[PDB]
Amino acid sequence: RNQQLRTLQEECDRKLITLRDEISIDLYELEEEYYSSSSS
Amino acid sequence: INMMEYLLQGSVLDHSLESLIHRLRGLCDNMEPETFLDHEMVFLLPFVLRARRSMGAPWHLRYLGQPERHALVRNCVDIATSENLTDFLMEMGFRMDHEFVAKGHLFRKGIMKIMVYKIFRILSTEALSLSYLVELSVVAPAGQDMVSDDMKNFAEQLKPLVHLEKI
Amino acid sequence: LPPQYVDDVISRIDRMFPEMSIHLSRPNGTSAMLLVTLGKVLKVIVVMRSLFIDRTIVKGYNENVYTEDGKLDIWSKSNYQVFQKVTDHATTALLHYQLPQMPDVVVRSFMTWLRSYIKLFQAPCQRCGKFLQDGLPPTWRDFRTLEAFHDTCR
Amino acid sequence: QKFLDIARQTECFFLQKRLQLSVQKPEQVIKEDVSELRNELQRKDALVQKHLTKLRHWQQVLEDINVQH
Amino acid sequence: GVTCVSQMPKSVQQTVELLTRKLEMLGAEKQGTFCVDCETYHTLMYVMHNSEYPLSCFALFENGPCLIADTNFDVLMVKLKGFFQSAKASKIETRGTRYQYCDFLVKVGTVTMGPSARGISVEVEYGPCVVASDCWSLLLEFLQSFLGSHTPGAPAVFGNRHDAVYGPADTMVQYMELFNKIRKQQ
Amino acid sequence: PHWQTKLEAAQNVLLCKEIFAQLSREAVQIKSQVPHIVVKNQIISQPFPSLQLSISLCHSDHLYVLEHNLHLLIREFHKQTLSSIMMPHPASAPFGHKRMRLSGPQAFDKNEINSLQSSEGLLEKIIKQAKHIFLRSRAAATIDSLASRIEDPQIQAHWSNINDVYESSVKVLITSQGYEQICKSIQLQLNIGVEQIRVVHRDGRVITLSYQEQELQDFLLSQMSQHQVHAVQQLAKVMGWQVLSFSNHVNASAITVASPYAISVRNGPESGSKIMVQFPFKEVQWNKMEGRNFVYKMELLMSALS
Amino acid sequence: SLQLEVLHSQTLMLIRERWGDLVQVERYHAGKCLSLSVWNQQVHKVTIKIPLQIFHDPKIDHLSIEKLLIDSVHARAHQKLQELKAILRGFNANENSSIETALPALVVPILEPCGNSECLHIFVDLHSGMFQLMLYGLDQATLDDMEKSVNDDMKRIIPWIQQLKFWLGQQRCKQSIKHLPTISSETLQLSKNKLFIKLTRLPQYYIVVEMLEVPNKPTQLSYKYYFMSPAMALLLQQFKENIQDAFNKVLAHFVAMCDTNMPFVGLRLELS
Numbered sequence A: 001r002n003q004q005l006r007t008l009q010e011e012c013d014r015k016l017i018t019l020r021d022e023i024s025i026d027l028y029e030l031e032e033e034y035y036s037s038s039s040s
Numbered sequence B: 001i002n003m004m005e006y007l008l009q010g011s012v013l014d015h016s017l018e019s020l021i022h023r024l025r026g027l028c029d030n031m032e033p034e035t036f037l038d039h040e041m042v043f044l045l046p047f048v049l050r051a052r053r054s055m056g057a058p059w060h061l062r063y064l065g066q067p068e069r070h071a072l073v074r075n076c077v078d079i080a081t082s083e084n085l086t087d088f089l090m091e092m093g094f095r096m097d098h099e100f101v102a103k104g105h106l107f108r109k110g111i112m113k114i115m116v117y118k119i120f121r122i123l124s125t126e127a128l129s130l131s132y133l134v135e136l137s138v139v140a141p142a143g144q145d146m147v148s149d150d151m152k153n154f155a156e157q158l159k160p161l162v163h164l165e166k167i
Numbered sequence C: 001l002p003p004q005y006v007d008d009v010i011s012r013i014d015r016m017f018p019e020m021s022i023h024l025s026r027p028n029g030t031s032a033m034l035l036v037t038l039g040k041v042l043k044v045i046v047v048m049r050s051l052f053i054d055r056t057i058v059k060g061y062n063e064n065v066y067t068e069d070g071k072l073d074i075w076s077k078s079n080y081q082v083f084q085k086v087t088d089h090a091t092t093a094l095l096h097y098q099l100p101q102m103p104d105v106v107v108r109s110f111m112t113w114l115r116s117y118i119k120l121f122q123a124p125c126q127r128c129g130k131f132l133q134d135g136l137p138p139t140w141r142d143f144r145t146l147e148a149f150h151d152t153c154r
Numbered sequence D: 001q002k003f004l005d006i007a008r009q010t011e012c013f014f015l016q017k018r019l020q021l022s023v024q025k026p027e028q029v030i031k032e033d034v035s036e037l038r039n040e041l042q043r044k045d046a047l048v049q050k051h052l053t054k055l056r057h058w059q060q061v062l063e064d065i066n067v068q069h
Numbered sequence E: 001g002v003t004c005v006s007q008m009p010k011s012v013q014q015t016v017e018l019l020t021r022k023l024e025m026l027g028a029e030k031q032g033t034f035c036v037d038c039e040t041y042h043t044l045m046y047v048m049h050n051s052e053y054p055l056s057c058f059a060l061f062e063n064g065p066c067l068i069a070d071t072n073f074d075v076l077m078v079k080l081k082g083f084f085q086s087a088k089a090s091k092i093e094t095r096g097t098r099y100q101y102c103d104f105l106v107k108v109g110t111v112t113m114g115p116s117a118r119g120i121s122v123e124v125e126y127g128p129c130v131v132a133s134d135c136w137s138l139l140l141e142f143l144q145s146f147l148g149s150h151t152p153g154a155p156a157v158f159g160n161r162h163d164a165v166y167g168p169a170d171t172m173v174q175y176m177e178l179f180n181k182i183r184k185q186q
Numbered sequence F: 001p002h003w004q005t006k007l008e009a010a011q012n013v014l015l016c017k018e019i020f021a022q023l024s025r026e027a028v029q030i031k032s033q034v035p036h037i038v039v040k041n042q043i044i045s046q047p048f049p050s051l052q053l054s055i056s057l058c059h060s061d062h063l064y065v066l067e068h069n070l071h072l073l074i075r076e077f078h079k080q081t082l083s084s085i086m087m088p089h090p091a092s093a094p095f096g097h098k099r100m101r102l103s104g105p106q107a108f109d110k111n112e113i114n115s116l117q118s119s120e121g122l123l124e125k126i127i128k129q130a131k132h133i134f135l136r137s138r139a140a141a142t143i144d145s146l147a148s149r150i151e152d153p154q155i156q157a158h159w160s161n162i163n164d165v166y167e168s169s170v171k172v173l174i175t176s177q178g179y180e181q182i183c184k185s186i187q188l189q190l191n192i193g194v195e196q197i198r199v200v201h202r203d204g205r206v207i208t209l210s211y212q213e214q215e216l217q218d219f220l221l222s223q224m225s226q227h228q229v230h231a232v233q234q235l236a237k238v239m240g241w242q243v244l245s246f247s248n249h250v251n252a253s254a255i256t257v258a259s260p261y262a263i264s265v266r267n268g269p270e271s272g273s274k275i276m277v278q279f280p281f282k283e284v285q286w287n288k289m290e291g292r293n294f295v296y297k298m299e300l301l302m303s304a305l306s
Numbered sequence G: 001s002l003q004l005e006v007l008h009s010q011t012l013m014l015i016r017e018r019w020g021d022l023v024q025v026e027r028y029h030a031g032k033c034l035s036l037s038v039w040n041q042q043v044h045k046v047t048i049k050i051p052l053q054i055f056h057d058p059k060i061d062h063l064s065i066e067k068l069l070i071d072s073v074h075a076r077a078h079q080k081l082q083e084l085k086a087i088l089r090g091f092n093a094n095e096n097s098s099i100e101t102a103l104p105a106l107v108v109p110i111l112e113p114c115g116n117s118e119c120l121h122i123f124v125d126l127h128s129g130m131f132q133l134m135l136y137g138l139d140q141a142t143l144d145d146m147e148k149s150v151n152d153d154m155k156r157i158i159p160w161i162q163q164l165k166f167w168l169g170q171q172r173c174k175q176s177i178k179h180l181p182t183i184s185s186e187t188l189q190l191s192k193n194k195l196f197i198k199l200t201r202l203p204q205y206y207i208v209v210e211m212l213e214v215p216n217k218p219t220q221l222s223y224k225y226y227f228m229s230p231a232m233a234l235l236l237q238q239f240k241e242n243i244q245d246a247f248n249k250v251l252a253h254f255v256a257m258c259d260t261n262m263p264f265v266g267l268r269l270e271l272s
C-alpha cells in the first residue's frame, strides 16, 4: 500500500507540474498584453 | 571521550531469513531498508584494525580492544578517514593478512543496530557461509549496565527465529 | 520551443568549447537547468525556460552544488564575495546578450562570455593592477572587446 | 552603407514632415486610431478565447484526477 | 583554497602587533582566533590538529600518504601509544588571532613551541579556488601589501599536474615545512 | 467507509495540535528580534511593521500557501529523525547525518559545518516566508499599479516561472510607447529577497534596495526619467542628428543632441523639460505639440526641425 | 478550591507547552492562594487570593490563566513602556514618541522626517520581560551589543540613542549615492565621525562630509573636499547657490554634478 500510494503522489505531481508549465507560457503571453494596453 | 560497544552474534539459515527480514523490519522502526555492500580488511602490526569501504562514503576504520552481564564488550574507537588510507597504512608498516566483503541488510532501533549479512571470501566473491550472521552492536560512551539490559529484552523478542549469544 | 529542441541546442554548445561540460537534469517541468563547469575554476547553475535563460548562480568549485539529493538547488548563493559579484555580473550580463528575435544566439552569446572566465585569477586588467581596491580579481569582462577591467574600473 | 542611410533618413524625413502637416487638417489619424483600438480589443478577446478553452480543458483533467482518487 | 605559509622574522613579539597593524591599515574584521597545533612522533609521522577544521585531524608524513581523519583519530594515537613512541620530543602549537579580509582569510600568529614563542607564521589561505599553482599569481600581489620586500617566491608544495586539485590536505604539508625550519634552528 | 473518514479527521487534528505546539513553544522560548505574542489559540506576531500574522488554530485572508506549507514543513522536521540518511553506507559506524559524517573527515570548513547545524526550526522557516510572501505583493502591486499610473513609458514585467519560497525573480523592460525595436533600453532583473529586494541594472550597476514599498516606487520613477533621456540618445544614433554632451546622472539626466540647430534636453522625475536651440534658445511645451506619447513627439520634433 | 485546582492544573499544562522556564508556580493551601512568577529573569508577581481577587505587586472571572497572565504582563509591560517614554522625555522636551496599544511598542523617530524604517522599534517581550529594539540597518552586531546594554538599565538608552542619530545620518548618505557611481566608505587611512565617498571615475578626487547635532534630533553636515585652489572657489559659489535654492537629495545633486565638471576641468588643466 505504501508503494501504490507513492505512485499517486508522483502521478498527480507530474500532471500538476504540467499545469504549472502550461500556465507559465499562458501567463507569459497574457502578461505582455496588459502592459501593451495603449491609452489605458 | 571513548565508547565501548555491546554486541552479540548469531546466524540464520537461508529459508529462515525470509521470515526474519519481515520480522525485524516490522519489530523495529525503519523505512525501506538499504542493502549495504562493504569491503573490509584487517591489519596487524597485536593492534588488530579493521578498515571498511562501502560501495561513495569514506573509508571507515574501527578498532576493538580486548573484551572486558549478558553482553560482550571491548573498548572501541571508530574514526572516519578519507580515501587512500590503504596505502597510508602500508607506509605505516601494517600488513594485510586477509580481506572479505560483506553483503546484506541492516535495520536500526533507538540506539542499537541490527545488520544481517554473509561473509564473502576474496581471492572473485565466494560465500564463506551459507547462513547469514546478525549482531546487535550498540555504541555508547561510558558504558553502563543499563544500556546492556535493554538489549536483553529485544533479544528475547528475536529469540524464536534465531537464538544468539556472545562468544 | 519543443522540449527536444532544448537538448539539441545545449548539446551543440558543449561541442564548441572543450573545457565546458554541460549537465541537463531538467528536474522541473520542461525548463532546462543546465549546469556548466569551467574546467576547474568555477561551477554555475542557470535556470532557463524554453531556451531563454533568466538566471545564473555562479558557485565556485569548492562549494557544493546539490542539497540532500540530485536536486540542483539553484538558489543557494556563493559564500565568497568574488563569486557573488560574478553572480550579479552573470545576472546582468545575461541580459545584455539577449536578442529577442533569435533564441540560438543568446545562449551561444552567453557561453562565449562564460568561456572567457576560465582565465580568472590570472589576467591583469588593462586599466590598473590585477588586484583592485576591494578583495575581488577582475570579475568583469566587456561584452564586445573582452577586457579585464574591474567593477570599479568603468 | 553610409550613403544608404542618409539618403533614406532623408526619405522618411520628407514623409515624416508630411505626417505632422497631414495630422492637422484631416481626421485620418483619428480614423486609424479607431481601427487600431478596435483591432487591439479584437486581439484581446481572441487571447481570452485561447485562455478559456485551455483553462477549461485543464479544469476537466484536474477534476478527472480527483474523481479517480 | 590556496595558501602561502611562510615565516617573517629583535622585538619578535612586537613584530606581530606591527605586522597586524599593517594588516589593520588595509581593513580586516577580527572574525575569530585560529589555533593550529602540531604533534611529533618517532617511527616518523606528524598529526596536525588544525583549526578551522574542528573535526579533521590531518595525519601526515614527510613526503608520502596523507589521510584526513575526524577528531576521534587522536584517541587512536593515545591508545595506540604502546607500539609507537608518543609525544617523542615536543609538540609545537601556533595560536593566533584570525583576520579574515574580504574573502582572503589571511591570518598571522606567533608559533609557540610551548612556551618559548620563537617564531612568526603567516596564513594566507585564499578560499575561492582549489586550482593553485596555475593560479599562484593572485596570492603574491595580496602578500606584497601585507609583508615587506621578502615575499616567498613559491610555496614549493605544488607538483604541477596537468589538472591540479589542491584541497586542504597539502596545506598541512606546507605547515610542516615551516615547522621543520623553526625546529631545526633555535 | 464512514469509519475511515471519522478516523482521518482525528489524525488531522492530532497532527494539527502538534503544529501549534511546535510554533507555540518556539515563539516564546527563542527570540529573533521580533515580538511574538501568545494567546489561547492565536500566536500573533509582527514580521513587518505593516503585517500581522494570525497563525490561529481553529477548532470545531486564508492564504493556503502559508497554511499548507506548515503541514509539509513539519514533516521535514519529523523526517530528520529515523531517516535513511542517518544510517552509514559503511556497515560499521555510529548513526549520524550522512552529510555530517562525511563532512568531518573530508576537512570541511569552520563556517559551512556550523551553518548546516544552525537550522532555524519551524517558526523562523515560516515567518521569513510570510516575510517574503507579502513583500512580494508590495513589490508586485507597485509594478502593476505603476503601469496604469504612468502611460508615457510602458513598464513591462516578465515574472519567472520558477520562484521558490525565500526568492523571486523579476524582469523589467522599460520601453517607450511602441518603439520596441528601434529603442530597446534599460531592463533590470529585480530579485525579491526575504528582507530586502535586490536589483541589477542594465548598464551594470547593482542597487541593493530598501524593503519598504515606497522606496521601490521611487527607484522605478528615477529609472523612468533616465529612459526618456536614453530615448534621445537612441534617436540620435538612428536619426540624422548627432550626439552632443551627455549626462547620465545629474537623479535628473540631461542630454544634448547635435543636428547637421540642436535640441538639448533635461528630463528629471519632476522636471521633464526640453529645448530648441537656434542661431539663445526658447522653451518647448508638448501640451500643444505632437500627439500620442513622448518618443513619437520627440521623433516628430526632430523630423520638424531638420 | 476547585477553581484553584483547575488554574494550577491548567497552569502546569500551560508550563509544559509555554513559559517552561519563564513562569514559576507556587501553590499555597494554608492561605488558599496560588502565585505565578512571571519574568523570572531580572519582578512582576501575580497571585490569586481567596469573592476572588488578583493582587499584582510589581478580574479573573475569565478563569483563563494563559489569558490572565498575558493581560497582567501586558499591563505591566505597558507600564514599563510608559516609564521609558518619561526617560525619553529627559533628553528632549519636544520629542515625538508613539506607543501602540495593540501590542507593546515604543516606535520613536530619531531625526527630522521618518520613514518608519529609521524609527527604532523598542518593544519589550510580554513573556521574557527584556527590552528589544530593532532597526532596519545598523549591522546586527551593533544592534545586539546595544540592546544587551540597554536591557539591564533604562538610563543607557539615552546615551546610545544619541549615536544612533549619528548613524542614521551616516547610513542615510550612503543610500542616496548608492545608485550614483561612487565608492562609499567609512574612515580611511590618511597618507566628528566624518564619512566620505571616492568616485570611481576620476579616482584622485574625494568628496567628504562632516556632521553635527545643532538642534535636538536634526543633524547638520558641512560638505568638504579633500582630494589626493582649482575648482574650489567655484564649489563655494555652488554652496551659496544651494543655500539660496531632501537634504540627502541635495547631496546627490552636488556629487554627480561635480563628478561631471571635474574631469572636464581636468581636461582643461591638461590643455593648459
Ligand SMILES: [Zn+2]
Binding pocket: C125, C127, C128, C129, C132, C149, C150, C153
Ligand atoms: Zn582595475
